[PDB]
Design a protein around this ligand. Sequence first.
Ligand SMILES: [Cu+2]
Ligand SMILES: [Cu+2]
Ligand SMILES: [Cu+2]
Ligand SMILES: [O]
Ligand SMILES: [O]
Length: 476
Amino acid sequence: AERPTLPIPDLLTTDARNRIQLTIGAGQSTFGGKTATTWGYNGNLLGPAVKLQRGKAVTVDIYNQLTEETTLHWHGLEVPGEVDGGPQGIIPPGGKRSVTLNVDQPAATCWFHPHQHGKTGRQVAMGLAGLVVIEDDEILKLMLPKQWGIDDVPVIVQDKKFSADGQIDYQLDVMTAAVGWFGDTLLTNGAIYPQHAAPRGWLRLRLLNGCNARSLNFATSDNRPLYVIASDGGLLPEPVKVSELPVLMGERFEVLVEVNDNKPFDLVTLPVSQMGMAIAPFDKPHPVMRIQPIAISASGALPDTLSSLPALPSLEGLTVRKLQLSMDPMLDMMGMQMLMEKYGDQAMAGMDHHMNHGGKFDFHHANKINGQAFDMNKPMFAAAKGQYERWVISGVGDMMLHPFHIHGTQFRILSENGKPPAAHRAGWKDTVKVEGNVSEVLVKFNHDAPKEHAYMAHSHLLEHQDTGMMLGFTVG
Ligand SMILES: [Cu+2]
Ligand SMILES: [Cu+2]
Ligand SMILES: [Cu+2]
Ligand SMILES: [O]
Ligand SMILES: [O]
């Protein structure tokens, strides 16, 4: 059979009442010919791309048609805590919540997803994620590829695993609380190995790692380069040519890739050095999508200069906040041993060379920051508003991957896990790698967040977030 075409999320803008309507609900999808219950925004799976303009406000009406509580967070969008949609932003089953978003940041590809307390991994795994396309006046002058679904395409890459009856097989248990939820099936905008027909010239891909726990590393099957033009929080100062592009959970990058007649190629993901993630079929490069060239000229440009990136300021005198991540040694060892028992040595490929004892030992609060599993009732600190701060995040103490995300900001990385950031990671970021080492980021919060609607800071390995590796903080 030929490959299915890449599904393209609809690009949604406001009505005359300046509203966007999002409905959260359950439906059915098909994977490898078997039906599965899935959840989506304005559909059965995944979601639309909400288009936003800097300096314009929009109202979003969010209808929860699930039978359980959910929340909706705009990952990457800088908004007051009251509309950030962290775990306090509950939408009752059958209810509606409206938010007004006053967009105040540069053009970027952001995304949106649930943030239900303790259940974010399940609700993402069941299907909920959408996109946000922010535009501003500056980016349009660059004349980048801009025809949505033709030469400007979102690429949301996610793994799932399924039970024998075809349903999504999600469990938050000791093993996945330890290593994360991951699967053997790769989806690209919800489809298994689709093709995308692209005009000759430049193709812009807006890449999102939407996996719960799997890191990815994009490349092309014939080693043509990718030109990175943007990171989580928007354009880089100039394109950065790469041969491969590691993407942590929740991160976005936009790249341009050349499309030439008569020479289809795949976007692939290369095996990563992360526990559990190189089990077959991920022990080898894995196709993500086939790019099928069309002999029609694409009009987009790859300009020499994209944007202005301001200098890092002086660090002297800035508040230094320490965030020590930790896992429970016993439960980390127990989850890792279950992984090894299940899959054997392959569960550590590529890595560097039973009774109830009560609630004190409950894996649901095994992961922590500064000695505390997430307490929704107690923000850990009150950050300054409009002031740069230096946040120091340590994963010393274990070797698991902690992509650390801070709500309410786009920051600058000073140190990523003990090294200065790569050039394509040196611009605006909302995620920083922490793994066995220490990262430091320069953050500023432009909006208030009160105790009742606090900003989150957490690992975006969802099973770790849900089992305590998150803190709340206020601003203002
Ligand atoms: Cu976020
Ligand atoms: Cu997020
Ligand atoms: Cu978050
Ligand atoms: O997030
Ligand atoms: O998140």
